[PDB]
Design a protein around this ligand. Structure first.
Ligand SMILES: O=C(O)[C@H]1O[C@H](O)[C@H](O)[C@@H](O[C@@H]2O[C@H](CO)[C@@H](O)[C@H](O)[C@H]2O)[C@@H]1O
Ligand SMILES: O=C(O)[C@H]1O[C@H](O)[C@H](O)[C@@H](O[C@@H]2O[C@H](CO)[C@@H](O)[C@H](O)[C@H]2O)[C@@H]1O
Ligand SMILES: [Cl-]
Ligand SMILES: [Cl-]
Lengths: 785, 785
């Protein structure tokens, strides 16, 4: 079973086998953790670079998680073994590592916690994890209850495996002073400079107990013996042996022995995390490890999540949509912009898109993100591939590989900010550039970004792609310096047309003419060189070849040039229907729209690394949600209301049981992708990546707020412009906007020809609420034909 | 139980639990594999850089093995499940993953193969692995026999898990055309240059069957189900489901169903390995996968190992020593110099030392190694940190961190070559330098190496250490450009005194005077600045501090300055006894001599990264065998025969049962270390690193041949100069030397005052056999007081 519980606070899954990859996440200012329904977990923290405290049993690569992460028996996780001392029978919570038969199982994803309830052998177990707002530590609460009529003698064993910490130095021992287990290592390195760099690393891992235990074990191998995780030797014996780890793989195992009366419950608290030293671990203990500590942390954490609750609550005839939108969407949006995915060098397009989403949550964060991003613009006008969030940080990984699309996002996403807040005054703020002494207004920075995009085009008027655009791994189209991008051209035309609208609003008329003319020139160049007769191609290679065309067997059509040709005006009214049909026939699936099709099955080396990913995974033809929402947004821009809604609603798994099972995901986040290559590999199509990091969600939230519900800001006020699906006879929303609240009721009426809006029960003319007072609440009735 | 079998060809261990980390290795021209007694294995191959075909279940770091490697349930390995179709009962060979009760267990390390015999449920299993000489492929032979009186119905399932190959792209399927399973991936990368670099990678993994199976499974998760490795779901059912892997972790599982008659045995062959494509896998199949293929490969492999059998066979009163020396030592020596540890940039001191060992096996290899190494000497005379073995290869890892000791090895190790072969004519060969147009003789290159060592010294006359010397991680003594090494100074004096002896032999008298004077000058500087009163210190820091002294609490004495002060003359007859006693009191242990003591327990940042390794592991105070054999060699150089023998013999585990259990190693190789920090952590002291890669063995073989048995070359012939331990009343050796054979019998006689040598039963004067004819055999009797 699977359903929302606790008035929307949590979402419960009642089988540990039906959806075995499913998971939820928690985060805070410095860390994140993905928790799998069976007990596996992946946790990363910032110090100020990424690190972990719970390691794999081998020397693992530096990485957070892979899409479709495989788990394996010794994967890091969070476990408790229960032993009936009278029978010797054992089970583990949450389900791994023993995988015994349970009488009850619940995995509860929470807004602010993650928890389980399980039962076996007549013993009822509860486990609850939460995080504080500002420190890196996991707060663990365990409850054990004898559910039967007679007393029961139990051994209870937390099992928090630390893993293989380091080949240079790893150990662990019990510390009575810290009150628990401290594992210790030295992160490996060879360069003397890295010793200085690594000096503040939190290379201890603690597992601390509020309640003193009967015994402990710190040696992984001694814990298992020949019985393994399934039946650990240390649990077969009466008492743990109290061993340590001396250049041996350490573990965190404690033992409590209890006689529990009929119906008696006992509570045990623990904290788990990284520390520089025992002093830090003790500081965390004193701060958190108590009923009062846990309560205060939970109260402060709930307040944090409430602070990000956003601006829209809905009541539609679809209760799955309601639950997702009201309870799950806002926190996922908030995570992205509040912590910027826990990287010190966010990819520029991610920093800008994620903070766009914050316009609807905490727009002062958005405002500062534009200021910060533009401070790092290059003197040429170009934007760097990443934005540095800390002094001394560096560009890493894909950010070192030259991509060309970084400027396009600036006006695209600033439009959402200006429409929502009306903060045109941001345009006058003065910020420096990455080098040189020039300090200029936001508005002048933006002019320079758009002059950059116009200048970074070939003799045909098409945008250079270098080693990629929005498609990160599309790296061999332009690596020789001539290849051009279909998507970036049509997106540039969009960007320039938006920015020209802003310039006109600001009385910067010469700029408006210049950018509008640029947009025309690009769209003309796209129509002459990129349009392929029924859809727009993807690009042109260094050697002059157009790809993403009907002559291509794989990669015959890409979604992105279509969406963005709609947005930027390359696609006129005659072409638009060709686009819609080509996308439906070649890209649409039951799990959503694929980003390209058919998926590539072998390298094509004038397109590049994207073609070597597994067909249907990631950029190679998945239902890549972020591309799907750009299409949805484009459909909204032309009033294709039914198509927009249908494709948006496909992004949410359920309630269909086959769909839920096939995607394998809890409906508590939107993942970066559901597997594509739907025609080529139907068995795996729809499978969830399980990755909660995705710029999808800022666009999905924008689409719902401005598009579907149609409650959009303008310089005059609140524009009412809904695109509800026709099936809905009625709906409600509550919109917070510019400090006021709008209680909106929508109803279809056969008595009218044209939408009619009533404010506080009297009819308005036009579609804008213009008199908005901070703290006031307004009743809006929107009657629709 | 543990003992030699098959006339020395193999070594058998009869418990899978008593020595669970124990292992043996095999290699060939392009690959190596360590095989653990329970079924785990680590295999690396060259293409021409290192790679693997059997992966961990996560994204693992690029690495071969760690010292004291921990295994875990999903570690790569080599397994076969047996199911009794009548009862449903299952077991696995060799022992993992099921860990059932067995009725019989044998792990057989071989010179040329690795094998097991096991029995359970009345079914007798044999498993045998070998490698061909020149291709990368594992040859697997499985035998299954019904040992009972009635027919038995069995399912037989090879389980060769492929692991997590790649986050970009991984898959696998059954191929009827190749005749087995092909897993496929794309090695991850981001830089366009890496696509071109990676084009010839063998990114498929094959598991091919000679005999067609009843079914197969390629999906790891489908294989396990909820039963895991302990009780795989796919084995509980009647037939495997024949699933594939589509961006899922692939595996190699087949199923055979057989009714076996009483006493009936059947044989099944498989090959496992990497391939570029199916064509390559089929080429390997046609070449190897047959009785005739396996036989021919085994015959050619045995011939290879016989070709490296070396120059000494012994028959002493110690049958453990005999077995090790005769059957295990030579192949371990041969591996090092024949394949240079399967790196394209061997560390220079390793390339020279490993090829020194080849002087006693295939000295033409040694000769070419000197030529190759010197061709890469810098115009200054300095030697690079590594030697490149392939065009386009680069220096990697520690080879990028400046160390200063690389020249010292040249005359140190060339001495062994010249004494063994008499090939002074090598000195006249002309080779270039790394840059420039200068081509000079070996001898002139060597003069330039020694002029380099004399020039790379500070105002006190002591050798600069930069970021390390022989001790790789000793990187903070001289990183500021002033610190100096105690060890390198005293070793330089040794090197110069050896080279001066060569110059004198070659009539290069001015060079001999120059180097002998250099050696005196260094030894004087060592005695004035390094000698600490009872032993020699280790170095002096950039800020002028002498460490490795009695004022140091940790790192109070290091072994190396002592050994090499004996060799190079810094230690006179008055100091020598102080050295011997300090080493015995502070460094000697029951498992051998520690390289430093007490071990460091925290960073000391004017010494460096060595002090951060776990105390007792690796360079931080282990029984580091290679340092131990330098001491042994030094002891031999001063006729400390009993001490030399005792400490050499400690390097070989057994026959004492407690010793064997505590080290945990099969006595079929010498590991790089046995754990030290004997006073500080006795529980773990002696534990084997299990690492067969070690420059120890070329020195141990030299010590036995020239020192203990005393059969040493000179320009006149064979010098007889034994240092047998006093316990031995008699011993024999057979020495191959310069094309002749010497059958040597040693006997103690109270009837003599001085050793007496008889050649073919008549007494010689002096101690040199000078008339040596190629192909002849000589009887030597050596009578000793
Ligand atoms: O780790 C992964 O597989 C993915 O994790 C997160 O979802 C990322 O957002 C993915 O990278 C994103 O790819 C798109 C398409 O190439 C880019 O437009 C975006 O800026 C980048 O974050 C990552 O693949
Ligand atoms: O991987 C390891 O732990 C070890 O593997 C092999 O045994 C190597 O030979 C070890 O490195 C060696 O260290 C010594 C002492 O610092 C050096 O003198 C030698 O050149 C280097 O190979 C390695 O630690
Ligand atoms: Cl794209
Ligand atoms: Cl040393």
């Amino acid at each position: 079973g699977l359903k929302a519980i606790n008035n929307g606070e949590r979402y419960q899954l009642t089988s540990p086998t039906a959806m075995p990859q499913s998971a939820s996440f928690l985060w805070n200012k410095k860390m994140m953790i993905q928790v799998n329904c069976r007990g596996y977990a992946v946790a990363q923290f910032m110090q100020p670079e990424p690190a972990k405290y719970a390691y794999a049993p081998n020397l693992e690569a530096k990485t957070f998680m892979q899409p479709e992460q495989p788990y394996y028996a010794h994967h890091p996780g969070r476990f408790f073994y229960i032993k009936d001392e009278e029978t010797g029978e054992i089970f583990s919570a949450p389900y791994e590592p023993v995988r015994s038969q349970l009488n009850n199982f619940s995995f509860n994803a929470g807004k602010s916690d993650i928890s389980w309830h399980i039962a076996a052998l007549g013993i009822e177990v509860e486990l609850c994890l939460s995080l504080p707002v500002d420190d890196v530590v996991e707060l663990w609460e365990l409850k054990i209850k004898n559910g039967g009529a007679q007393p029961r003698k139990l051994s209870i064993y937390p099992y928090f495996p630390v893993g293989y910490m380091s080949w240079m130095n790893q150990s662990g021992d019990y510390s009575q002073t810290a009150g628990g287990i401290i594992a210790s290592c030295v992160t490996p390195y060879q360069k003397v400079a890295d010793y200085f760099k690594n000096k503040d690393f939190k290379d201890k891992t603690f597992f601390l107990h509020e309640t003193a235990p009967a015994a402990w074990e710190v040696n992984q191998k001694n814990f298992e013996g020949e019985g393994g995780l399934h039946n650990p030797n240390a649990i077969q014996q009466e008492t743990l042996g109290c061993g340590n780890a001396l250049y041996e793989t350490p573990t965190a195992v404690l033992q409590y022995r209890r006689e529990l009366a009929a119906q008696e419950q006992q509570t045990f608290r623990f904290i788990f995390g990284p520390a520089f030293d025992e002093s830090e671990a003790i500081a965390l203990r004193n701060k958190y490890l108590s009923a009062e500590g846990f309560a205060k942390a939970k109260s402060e954490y709930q307040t944090y999540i409430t602070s990000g609750k956003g601006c829209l609550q809905i009541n539609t005839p679809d209760p799955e949509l309601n639950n997702f939108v009201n309870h799950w969407l806002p926190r996922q949006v908030f995570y992205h912009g509040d912590v910027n995915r826990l990287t010190t060098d966010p990819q520029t397009r991610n920093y800008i898109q994620d903070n766009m989403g914050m316009s609807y949550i905490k727009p002062n964060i958005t405002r500062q993100a534009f200021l910060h991003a533009l401070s790092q613009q290059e003197e040429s006008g170009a934007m760097p591939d990443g934005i540095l969030l800390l002094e001394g940080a560096e560009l890493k990984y894909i950010n070192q590989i030259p991509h060309t699309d970084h400027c396009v996002w600036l006006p695209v996403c600033m439009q959402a900010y200006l429409d929502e807040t009306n903060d045109y005054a941001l345009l006058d703020e003065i910020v420096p550039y990455a080098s040189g002494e020039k300090r200029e207004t936001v508005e002048q920075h933006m002019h320079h970004a758009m002059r950059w995009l116009l200048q970074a085009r070939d003799e045909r008027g098409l945008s250079f792609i270098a080693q990629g655009d929005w498609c990160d791994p599309m790296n061999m189209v332009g690596y020789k310096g001539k290849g051009v991008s279909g998507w970036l051209s049509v997106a540039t035309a969009y960007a320039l047309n938006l920015w020209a609208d802003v310039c006109e609003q600001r009385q910067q008329n010469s700029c408006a003419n210049e950018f509008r003319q640029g947009a025309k020139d690009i769209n003309a160049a796209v129509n002459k060189h990129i349009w392929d007769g029924e859809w727009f191609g993807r690009g042109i290679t260094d050697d002059g070849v157009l790809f993403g065309t009907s002559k291509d067997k794989e990669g015959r059509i890409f979604l992105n040039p279509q969406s963005w040709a709609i947005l930027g005006g390359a696609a006129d009214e005659q072409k638009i229907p060709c686009l819609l049909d080509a996308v439906e026939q070649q890209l649409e699936t039951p799990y959503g729209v694929m980003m390209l099709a058919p998926a590539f099955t072998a390298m094509r080396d004038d397109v590049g690394r994207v073609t070597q990913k597994f067909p249907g995974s990631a950029e190679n033809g998945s239902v890549y949600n972020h591309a799907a929402v750009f299409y949805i947004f484009s459909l909204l821009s032309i009033g294709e209301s039914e198509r927009a809604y249908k494709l948006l609603r496909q992004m949410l798994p359920g309630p269909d049981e086959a769909d839920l099972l096939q995607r394998g995901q809890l409906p508590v986040f939107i993942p970066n992708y559901y597997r594509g290559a739907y025609y080529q590999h139907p068995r795996t199509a729809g499978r969830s990546s399980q990755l909660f990091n995705t710029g999808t969600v800022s666009w999905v939230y924008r689409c719902l707020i401005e598009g579907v519900f149609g409650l959009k800001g303008s310089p005059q006020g609140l524009v009412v412009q809904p695109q509800l699906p026709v099936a809905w006879q009625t709906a409600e929303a509550v919109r917070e906007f510019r400090g006021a609240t709008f209680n909106v009721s929508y109803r279809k009426s056969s008595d009218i020809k044209e939408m009619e809006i009533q404010l506080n029960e009297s009819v308005i003319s036009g579609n804008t609420i213009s008199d908005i007072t901070a703290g006031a609440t307004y009743q809006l009735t929107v009657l629709l034909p």
